[model samples]
Target: SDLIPAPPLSKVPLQQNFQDNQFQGKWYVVGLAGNAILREDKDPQKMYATIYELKEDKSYNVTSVLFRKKKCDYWIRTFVPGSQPGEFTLGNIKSYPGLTSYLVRVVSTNYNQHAMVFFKKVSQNREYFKITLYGRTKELTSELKENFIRFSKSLGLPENHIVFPVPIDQCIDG
Candidate 1:
């Protein structure tokens, strides 16, 4: 079996001096590539939108909306800042039955137009990629899109496992 190991944090480069305030805004999740439920057929798993709100004490609040089962499903979560900049932690939510740990890292971002985020999820002694490509607006540049895919593949993800969901206007404003 081709071995795809969980990317150790030490080896992952992060955004230089990531500021929570700069990242607080709307970000459209333009691309999603990874294992878990997302590896299913592309009929229902469309693109989603997320808005980040900065807290007084460095934490962040996340509001996301995506279509599922023919309905708009909304989700809310909190991200606690990690010891290093551009690194965050999320947990205590029912992501999966055996989910043991979850981590988020901001690989790169201009805080103006585009960003790439990595979600490292571990469940049942398994660690896989749940990386995302974020666009400030609905528009995504070709370079940014390529960058996302290039890095994902380098991390051992197969080419066929990626998907660029159709952009939708549902549940974006609020």
Candidate 2:
């Protein structure tokens, strides 16, 4: 009974005009929707940040750092392109192991100012959603936060399910 819910009845919209090369860079996690994956056994207020490198073959190398228990937990997420554009299969390597298919679409972005990433996860029996608010800096404007909340609701997430996780500043050098 713990299966993740299905996506919306309509197909989720994606950014069709952007290239994968434009997605490579460091993105600070300004907000995160509360989900089972975001929870930890120790700390409850966990947060994260990510760095991405777009490969020549279009594969993406994602480095994510989890801030929990007052320490930095780092992991790699290799996003290999799927059969369709704007689609990728997420693979965890050198650490946590799981094969999760994903559809990544840039809901909105200025390429350097901020980006709203609409991420969908689909498994054999479950579907999970996460809309990430990525900012060039740790400080995001109030207007951006409000817009992120609104966009998340459009994906069928209730108001209570959306949460802004604090940015991590400690143990980053590790």
Candidate 3:
């Protein structure tokens, strides 16, 4: 018998009406699903913010601001659209070093309110899956959580794998 099923990435659908411009501005991570190692790397509990500024050539200059122990860590990268519609390219990370390959895709989103970003990577000859449910604000609706869980499940993640971090008030600024 097989040990664990890797997610079927090809089966996962991207958001409809895809528009690079829609995701401009701020979005906060309200949910995550991954292993313990990944949990520490992306630390959903910190309630990080990802800001996206698009380029005219169908690319994005993305930046993420995360807090750990009262300090802010900034990550800046550029994501370019793939040949296929609704597809983009991103890669690599920490903790799981020497990552052979990685991918980040827009599984679902409305841009104005909610987004589902699905990430998959191969580390140490093993596969890892991470998903982030982002919102315009820290607030998340039960319906949104339901959608996220179902999406993760479809990607072969069990219920216990997902983490819904409690939004921290300290790091946020209005």
Candidate 4:
């Protein structure tokens, strides 16, 4: 019997009290990993982007837009505060069935330059993990790319597991 091994837990610790204001604004996805185990046999050219808005109620309005397989798509998730700072539970977002919880942690960030976000989702029997390197702009430096790859590998992804999706503009233009 051949079985796929589970990905390792992240070595990067989760951020506490991730200041909503500091993280607010648009972020372009520059790097991603863990899709092979999460979405098997999917297209290799998928991209992700997001806009985060802070609410008066101390929650957040998250809009995740995707460019994939030559198409554009989007979805919304409302994040309500959890017991711990920087922690949230997917509230009133009913799209994903059997979704027990969702959490977003800022692994690291420069506030204005770039940010590494760790997003986790758990269901009845399945868990999905994603590390997103977000840039204030759609472009990333070579150093940033290398750092992301190293970081992701430290979290158990193979070196080649990290992938950079084609820019959204290319999707729109093509």
lDDT of 1 at 154: 71
Give all TM-scores, in the order shown.
0.86, 0.78, 0.81, 0.79
lDDT (0-100) at residue 65 of candidate 4? Answer: 79
lDDT values for all models? 0.78, 0.68, 0.73, 0.72
- Scanning candidate 4 in windows of ten residues, the lowest lDDT window is 1-10
Model 1, 1-174: lDDT tens per residue? 234676667656799989779999889888877654345563645678888998887788888987777787879888888878899987455765887877989989998888888888776768766778888887788888888888877766776666677787777645
At residue 134, candidate 4 shows an lDDT of 89
Q: Measured by TM-score, how close is model 2 to the native structure?
A: 0.78
Of the two candidates 1 and 2, the one with more favorable TM-score, higher being better, is 1
Candidate 3 lDDT, 63-168, residue by residue in tens: 8887777777788876667646566665224534666766777888888989988766676777766788998989889999998888777766777677777676
- Candidate 2 residues lying further than 4 Å off, grouped into runs, are 1-4, 9-11, 34-44, 83-85, 91-100, 172-174
Q: Is candidate 3 or candidate 4 better by TM-score?
A: 3
- Candidate 1's displacement at residue 126, Å, is 2.7
Task: For model 2, name the residue pairs that clash.
Answer: none
- lDDT per residue for candidate 4 within 15-120, as digits (tens), equals 6557778988788887886534333346565556788888999788988777655567777888787756666677874677788767766777887979887767
Q: Which ranking of candidates, highest TM-score first?
A: 1, 3, 4, 2
Which should have the higher lDDT, number 3 or number 4? Answer: 3
Steric clash pairs (candidate 1): none
Each prediction's RMSD to truth? 2.7, 3.7, 4.1, 3.8
Residue pairs with backbone overlap in model 4: none
